[PDB]
């Protein structure tokens, strides 16, 4: 429960390492 930009930063770090970085670029070409 926080804002749209912050809720992608909180999804978007989890992952792994390389994960992340591939997540934040690829989502949105691929979902």
Do not use: A, C, F, Y
Request: charged share 30%.
């Amino acid at each position: 429960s926080v804002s749209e930009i912050q809720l992608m930063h909180n999804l978007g770090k989890h992952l792994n390492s390389m994960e992340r970085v591939e997540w934040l670029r690829k989502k949105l070409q691929d979902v």
